[PDB]
Design a protein around this ligand. Structure first.
Ligand code: HEM
Ligand code: HEM
Ligand SMILES: CNCc1ccc(-c2cncc(CCc3cc(C)cc(N)n3)c2)cc1
Ligand SMILES: CNCc1ccc(-c2cncc(CCc3cc(C)cc(N)n3)c2)cc1
Ligand SMILES: C[C@H](O)[C@H](O)[C@H]1CNc2nc(N)[nH]c(=O)c2N1
Ligand SMILES: C[C@H](O)[C@H](O)[C@H]1CNc2nc(N)[nH]c(=O)c2N1
Ligand SMILES: [Zn+2]
Lengths: 407, 411
């Protein structure tokens, strides 16, 4: 019941007591571990609200106080009456920051308390959504000095009036299936790109076309908007030693901004809550550029390096992988756009874990996602035991809109 | 119940039914996952059903389930348990059990080879000297002059837990570690404590950076005894780099034969506390973990120095760059000396084929993603994108406590 986690590189042992406050389920049982699986009413609402308000008032050292009991009272009344309730600005900011704090798959959580929360609950139309999102993008980008931010749109009511951003990320590149049979641009976005076209987009059918926003307000049919190009900061990718690297024509966007998740706070559901931080290098260089189901450029780069691609045991893939990731970091740094390498980011996370164990009694963590997709065991997180569990407030996955939307 | 796993690179979906045959616990609950945790005297009472379950599995596999031979054997084992409080496996059952323990090892990426295992029955062994002989023969057989062959040697099963056979070495072949007065370490830092035990037991340490440790062998619950493996039986490989001529001057070598000797083999409820087994290396075990872990030989610095990489900013990825060259050298060196080794690309590709095969013919393949994905270049290998279910089947290999913590010394 009081669990220990060991670091096998440093022999340091931490005791987790925070997991006892876990509410949601893991997918695992005593018979089977699903640790590597990607996706494993009035009555219900009040205890959820209560649990949240309890931890909120605890956090501001006013547990069991007049203000605490009064607020509990007021929300209890509002639920009984309106079948839902509205968060105070203070509770919203707290809940959003803690949703990030609780994101067990996020390596960047040392920054959790420095989140800019944009309250967009007064939004009523897709054009308003577009305005709010442009402002978010401009604020977060900050001319390359990236700042964490989240924009929170109205909460779900009867499920028939959902606000949704249909894009998976605010900024991503289009994908087109070729008559050649191959794929132009980002293969991961072919389906979404078609929906844009099926909704009326005018695709420039290029390799790095920034997708339009598909925004859905109040359960209405979604609408298309183009983000002002001058708000999308991009970085041309070059290598500090290989001059030929630029001729690959590679670039990527500066702002990683997830827009398809659901923010749960005190039982309330925010179906549209785009949030953003800044990249860890490997997200671009390892996953985006080198996955076989993505831009898959390993072979092209290896060839330019004149490596022996006869035998896998020459580790040509590995050698090119490193150089690509060198170039990404180099390119971002040179253009003064915030980025963190996997060594720095994972070192930060260990320090954050130790902070969380000390001041909170634990830190939920998903090793499968926290360990970088290259060079894993030379980062300190590899040797760090982690316990994974689900605390609320939380970011949750939700069904893709097109599979749900009643047109 | 049915369980699906998805490969996110290929969209291949597989259905697991084998997990229904799972008995042991995982450590996880509905409220916590312990998937990244390293480590999460038996009465006749609990022994009959474990024996029965195993023999049902055995006779099913040979297509003789429910036969008179099956029924006679159950009867025979039953009587033997209630008479003697234990029982003995037939040779056929032992071989089956050992192969299936490997087949079931959810942390092992090399399992495509599970059916080709050489099983050495040492259940007639009675002394440490006899253990030494059996282990020498295993090492010679497995090594096969560099053409490695998988093998396992099985010493007598536990009885009352007061007469255990144990190999005190974690692996049959390993280098000594010496903690210096100034706090530095000579040799392999992982083996400092075991080295000290050996020294206390009378081992004369050469005190070099690559001294092969003596065997410390315990038979029938007696105090362990020291034995030196004949050097001519210990195949080693000098590490050099195909393009970097200064790499040889680092003075590195490694042994060819990975042989785990501290685990417990469970078969039909019986416990084999000494069951050394060996295969061949995947490159990264040596080049990533053995050489580059901060808690091991830790040579990233010197290699990066000699490469003249920019070492002031970690964002130069000088650590990653050095790591790759070292792993190139390890593979190159083994291949050049014709000692069996497999790169992490080949090994993970084979495991996926194995896994898919197992789903089709067996209804599953328990696998621990945390261990299966290699310690470098994870997502450019096919296993990274593969969803896996982890559960525990028997026969199995299990961890057991270090013997120096539990042994009652005779004197
Ligand atoms: C500011 C610097 C940040 C860094 C360096 C960072 C880093 C990462 C990385 C590398 C991942 C793995 C995701 C993948 O590989 O696809 C991740 C996941 C995640 N991050 Fe963070 N992140 C940052 C900011 C944030 C912020 C501001 C939030 C929320 C307010 C957040 C919430 C999450 C969540 C919920 C996941 C899981 C995503 C999923 O399941 O798809 N992150 N992060
Ligand atoms: C024949 C080629 C083999 C290869 C390439 C291979 C590969 C590996 C690797 C890379 C690991 C992880 C090692 C680590 O990082 O500590 C491992 C673990 C393991 N292997 Fe295999 N192995 C092979 C043979 C065998 C054999 C013959 C057996 C048993 C008969 C076996 C049983 C296991 C077990 C039980 C583990 C888990 C170790 C632990 O929990 O500490 N393997 N294997
Ligand atoms: C085959 N899979 C392709 C694919 C899968 C998942 C994703 C993805 C989708 N949504 C979110 C992410 C998380 C990335 C992220 C988010 C944030 C806030 C910061 C950061 N550094 N990185 C990743 C992209 C592409
Ligand atoms: C971190 N302390 C050093 C260390 C600790 C444990 C191990 C280790 C422990 N148990 C099992 C292993 C398996 C290694 C292996 C075994 C076999 C049969 C084949 C193979 N290729 N590799 C390795 C190695 C090194
Ligand atoms: C804490 C964590 O589970 C530990 O470092 C694991 C990670 N994955 C591993 N994978 C392999 N093959 N071998 C290991 O020793 C480890 N160590
Ligand atoms: C199947 C496996 O869980 C899947 O490939 C995971 C592994 N680890 C990951 N880790 C991160 N950070 N992001 C991912 O998308 C994944 N994918
Ligand atoms: Zn689990």
């Amino acid at each position: 019941r009081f669990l220990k986690v060991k670091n096998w590189e440093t022999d340091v042992v931490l005791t987790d007591t925070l997991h006892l406050k876990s509410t949601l389920e893991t997918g695992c049982t005593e018979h089977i571990c699903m640790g590597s699986i990607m996706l494993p009413t009035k009555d219900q609402l009040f205890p959820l609200a209560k649990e949240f308000l309890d931890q909120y008032y605890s956090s501001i050292k006013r547990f069991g106080s007049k203000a605490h009991m009064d607020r509990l009272e007021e929300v209890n009344k509002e639920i009984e009456s309106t079948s839902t309730y509205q968060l105070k600005d203070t509770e919203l900011i707290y809940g959003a920051k803690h949703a990030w704090r609780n994101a067990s798959r996020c390596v960047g959580r040392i920054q959790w308390s420095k989140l800019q929360v944009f309250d967009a609950r007064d939004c009523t139309t897709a054009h308003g959504m577009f305005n709010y999102i442009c402002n978010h993008v401009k604020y977060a980008t900050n001319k390359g000095n990236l700042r964490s931010a989240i924009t929170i749109f109205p909460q779900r009511t009867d499920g028939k009036h959902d606000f949704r951003v249909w894009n998976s990320q605010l900024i991503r590149y289009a994908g087109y299936k070729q008559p050649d049979g191959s794929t132009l641009g980002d293969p991961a976005n072919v389906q979404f790109t078609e929906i844009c076209i099926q909704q009326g987009w005018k695709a420039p059918r290029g390799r790095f076309d920034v997708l339009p926003l598909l925004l859905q307000a109040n359960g209405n049919d979604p609408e298309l908007f183009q983000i002002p190009p001058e708000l999308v900061l991009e970085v041309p990718i070059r290598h500090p030693k290989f001059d030929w690297f630029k001729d690959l024509g590679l670039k990527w966007y500066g702002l990683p901004a997830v827009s398809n998740m659901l923010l749960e706070i005190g039982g309330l559901e925010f179906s549209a809550c785009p949030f953003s931080g800044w990249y860890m290098g490997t997200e671009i260089g390892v996953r985006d550029y080198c996955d076989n189901s993505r831009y898959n450029i390993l072979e092209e780069v290896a060839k330019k390096m004149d490596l022996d691609m006869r035998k896998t045991s020459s580790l040509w893939k590995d050698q090119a992988l490193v150089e690509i990731n060198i170039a990404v970091l180099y390119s971002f740094q040179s253009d003064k756009v915030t980025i963190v390498d996997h060594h720095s980011a994972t070192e930060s996370f260990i320090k954050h874990m130790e902070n969380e164990y000390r001041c909170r009694g634990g830190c939920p963590a998903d090793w499968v996602w926290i360990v970088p997709p290259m060079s894993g065991s030379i980062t300190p997180v590899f040797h760090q035991e982690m316990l994974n569990y689900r605390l609320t407030p939380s970011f949750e996955y939700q069904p893709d809109p097109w599979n749900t939307h009643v047109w």
